[PDB]
Amino acid sequence: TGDAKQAIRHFVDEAVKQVAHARTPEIRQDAEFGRQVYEATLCAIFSEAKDRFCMDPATRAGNVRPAFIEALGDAARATGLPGADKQGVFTPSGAGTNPLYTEIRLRADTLMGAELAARPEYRELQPYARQQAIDLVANALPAERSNTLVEFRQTVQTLEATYRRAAQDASRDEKGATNAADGA
């Protein structure tokens, strides 16, 4: 309860190191699966991004989800994700979870499964673990692909905060007042 802002943040850090060290030898020894992770890593952000937006109580339906999907796909496209084009809509086949990012999140989840995880501070704290987790994957890759993860990662954060805020703006704007304020 002290401050999930710094607490959960540091707990996730421990997972990242432990796991990073766990499979780091394989990336060096088998510098081939790291590249596969790069694609899945983005997928996790892509899939999680939608889930986070969808889960939010102020963006449950028709609020800005369709738009979030379109904007999310646009940035995830610039990355050049080898997804699948269906009926003109470009969307990844799935596999949001599966790599190290998934493994580190679960570990930190168990320790912080307390009130910390229940605090809203948790939602914004998205780019802390990702910044370190994506860095390791980007390690097996040049500075190029690395920029891609950084670009998409911030873009999502910006899209989410902007879209989430936009939804809240309309919520506060439409709050229980205006509507039931006819008798004002």
List of domains in the chain: 1-175 (1.10.4120.10)
Instruction: Return the number of other C-beta atoms located less than 10 Å from residue 143's C-beta.
Output: 7
Q: Name the method of structure determination.
A: NMR
- The beta-carbon contacts of 102-106 under 8 Å, at least 24 apart in sequence, are 102/44, 103/15, 103/19, 104/12, 104/15, 104/16, 104/18, 104/19, 104/129, 104/133, 105/12, 105/15, 105/129
Residue with tokens 């990844």: 92
Nearest to 166 by CA among 52, 63, 60: 63
Q: Is the Cβ–Cβ distance between 99 and 44 less than 8 Å? A: yes
Please state, in angstroms and rounded to a whole number, the distance separating the CA atoms of residues 44 and 130.
Answer: 10
Please state, in angstroms and rounded to a whole number, the distance separating the CA atoms of residues 111 and 106.
Answer: 9
Phi-psi region of 142 (alpha: psi -120 to 50; beta: other; left: phi over 0): beta
109 Cα distance to chain centroid: 15
Angstrom distances, CA of residue 163 to CA of 29, 59, 140: 42, 9, 33
Instruction: Return the number of other C-beta atoms located less than 10 Å from residue 3's C-beta.
Output: 11
DSSP class of residue 56? S
Nearest to 134 by CA among 154, 107, 111: 154
Please state, in angstroms and rounded to a whole number, the distance separating the CA atoms of residues 3 and 121.
Answer: 8
152 Cα distance to chain centroid: 10
Please state, in angstroms and rounded to a whole number, the distance separating the CA atoms of residues 11 and 162.
Answer: 27
Residue with tokens 């790069």: 38
CA angle 154-158-159, nearest 5°?
A: 115
Give, rounded to a whole angstrom, the gap between the first and last alpha carbons of the chain: 40
Nearest to 42 by CA among 99, 90, 89: 99
